[PDB]
Amino acid sequence: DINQYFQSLTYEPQEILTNEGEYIDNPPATTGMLENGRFVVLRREKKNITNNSADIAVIDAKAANIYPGALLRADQNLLDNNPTLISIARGDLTLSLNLPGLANGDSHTVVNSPTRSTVRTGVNNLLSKWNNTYAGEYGNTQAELQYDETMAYSMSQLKTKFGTSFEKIAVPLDINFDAVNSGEKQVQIVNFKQIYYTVSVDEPESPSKLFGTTVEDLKRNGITDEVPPVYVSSVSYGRSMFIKLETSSRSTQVQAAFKAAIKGVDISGNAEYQDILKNTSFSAYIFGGDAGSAATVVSGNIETLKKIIEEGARYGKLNLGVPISYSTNFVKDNRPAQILSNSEYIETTSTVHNSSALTLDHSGAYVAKYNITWEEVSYNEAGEEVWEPKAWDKNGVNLTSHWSETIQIPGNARNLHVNIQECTGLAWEWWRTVYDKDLPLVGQRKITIWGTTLYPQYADEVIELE
């Protein structure tokens, strides 16, 4: 009996579907740079990404050996999203057609001598029975949106976020890891899946029910306690769109910007910082819907992306789609074949700190002592902050009657303090403090003292730029 042998099969499913790989070392200590009156704080930290899932998203419509009820081997091939098919005498099995939100549809059909052709035929009579009357030919309300976003930092971490095919779409996607690492550009990758339907296979009550003259014709197909058999349980059909979004923006509101952008929820309206969207250059690898043969690569601009997703969503059809994701189960215990994958990577985040301008104006019938101070950030080795004391070069200096000077506090500065005093004709209170405050490093700030020795009057004003 086969079931007995299947029950005797002693393997470790999870350990045979594992993807290690760290090779991360240690990232160069965080540093600080000066660029065009701005301060660039570069901080890159070592992180780890993990992905354990039995839902395999496809990529190459040609490298597809996937179909509902497909009997596949459980090996490195299956692990690398390039499984091996076991073409043996197949046992009749029942297939069902699941739709996103079609109430109680779930059309069922029987399948004899299971194979690409037969399954294709079943799915054909299904989809045909569906399109024949139901108003769901070109589009169907809201197909299942499977949105998988992630900021790009490492080919491997992307290989973990999507699998071992992003290595295949990498060239078309054109990702700038060097730039991201340098901190120049910022790029997010988004797996936008748009499932129109989903073919399900009735869980085999028994391996015997799956495969009756199959006495021991298993060892002649590659079945062993070393190479367990799996079967494609569910296959999702729709439009798969792997989009790459690059922008020269900073590390502020980017995620939200991109996500909201891709989701296209009229974010444009009341969009505080939309410079990212005005600087969103994209490149998308799409397949499904528009065609059931080849894929399409489109590089361009934010708008082009919007109109491309909008014209790619409800412009396709339902008649016949392409496999964009699938799932398989072990033949023995019908356990979900959950591929695991780990990957350490480097998250590189930079921060811009603008210059600061402090104008000083003296209009007093007297002599005014000036005294302004602050501290500057120094990023030495070990990536540890080093705040260094700084004071105005003319500090302690006393200015006569009228004076004026604008000062340029660097971006890597903080804890600004201003202290200005005025000389009085008094011997007891020779010096009278006029102004003394801790000040925020706002864009532009003008401080104007003026008036009489017996009465000094000041003015602290703040201005903007652009």
Ligand SMILES: OC(C(F)(F)F)C(F)(F)F
């Ligand atoms: O790539 C096509 C284009 F260009 F958007 F028209 C498709 F419609 F398929 F998306």
